[PDB]
Write a protein that binds this ligand. Sequence first.
Ligand code: I8P
Ligand code: ADP
Ligand code: MG
Ligand code: MG
Ligand code: MG
Ligand code: MG
Ligand code: MG
Length: 325
Amino acid sequence: RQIVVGICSMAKKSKSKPMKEILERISLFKYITVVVFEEEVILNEPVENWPLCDCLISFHSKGFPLDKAVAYAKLRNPFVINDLNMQYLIQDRREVYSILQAEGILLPRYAILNRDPNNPKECNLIEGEDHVEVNGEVFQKPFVEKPVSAEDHNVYIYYPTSAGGGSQRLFRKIGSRSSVYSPESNVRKTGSYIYEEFMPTDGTDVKVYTVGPDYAHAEARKSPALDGKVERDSEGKEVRYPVILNAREKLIAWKVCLAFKQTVCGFDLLRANGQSYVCDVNGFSFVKNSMKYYDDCAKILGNIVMRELAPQFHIPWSIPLEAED
Ligand SMILES: O=P(O)(O)O[C@@H]1[C@@H](OP(=O)(O)O)[C@H](OP(=O)(O)OP(=O)(O)O)[C@@H](OP(=O)(O)O)[C@H](OP(=O)(O)OP(=O)(O)O)[C@@H]1OP(=O)(O)O
Ligand SMILES: Nc1ncnc2c1ncn2[C@@H]1O[C@H](COP(=O)(O)OP(=O)(O)O)[C@@H](O)[C@H]1O
Ligand SMILES: [Mg+2]
Ligand SMILES: [Mg+2]
Ligand SMILES: [Mg+2]
Ligand SMILES: [Mg+2]
Ligand SMILES: [Mg+2]
């Protein structure tokens, strides 16, 4: 029989153009059949009625019932491409940073400010004009303030008085804008945050996209805080610039992929001061608008499936050479 690869995610992701481009390519494998789980089934049917698969590609995004996906995996015991339990941790920036540190991955110096919502003023925070002290640790402006929830994209950057003060407020892109300047110089007074040193880059973020530990595509984009005006092409896509990862960065990608147990994994690098710092690990993310990435991503995933499952299906399989980017 065919090896079944099940795709289990919210429709917003499962029906995205990149997903469709990759799935049609995975379907080219002679012995693989792709089955995309309907969102209505994911949300409203018990896991016992979800379709069978032999390999499960499943990932959390807003509204996804991760507890059900875990229960399904436990019930059916499929080969899992992106580990589900790690996806609980990926939702919490504190957990993400803790894993990065445990793996010896360079990241910004940071401190966690946990605030009791019932008692917001008695947290370990002291604030001056050009700095904060978080659990006694000092951050001179510029510094970055991130909500502990990784799914909250309201990241603020606080500028020193010498540069005019105020702050840049980042958010999920709204049409042409990715951030806005605020005259507010004082930090947020409710919520829990990570405070971290600002890493000076050349004005770009490096976005990395792994497909297993030995492949990563990288590309760059204008730092969303620089002025908040998104660079768009004639198709309405964000302008992306060429990047080739150096040897250190290829190792970082290997480590992130394995540490988070996410075969398909996006994360962000800040190239600063002659090193590269991870500032965000998002888990499952596909590149938009690279034909070559669709080809490579589909072939690697299909080959991962065959390698793991061909023997139990009695299908002959010889491990082919794969590119690294
Ligand atoms: O909101 P989510 O998290 O469910 O989905 C978002 C996520 O896509 P994913 O699921 O990972 O593929 C972002 O990638 P990411 O994971 O690297 O995120 P972070 O580094 O944590 O910010 C992506 O930003 P980008 O990397 O393309 O700039 C963003 O596109 P959008 O702002 O629309 O960009 P445009 O199409 O307008 O240019 C998506 O927003 P929506 O689709 O509106 O919800
Ligand atoms: N320590 C830092 N130094 C400089 N820029 C940062 C730092 N942390 C985040 N940023 C900038 O803010 C953006 C959003 O932060 P990120 O941690 O990626 O949050 P999100 O999960 O919302 O994407 C980054 O892409 C980067 O441009
Ligand atoms: Mg097929
Ligand atoms: Mg996500
Ligand atoms: Mg959007
Ligand atoms: Mg990011
Ligand atoms: Mg993120």
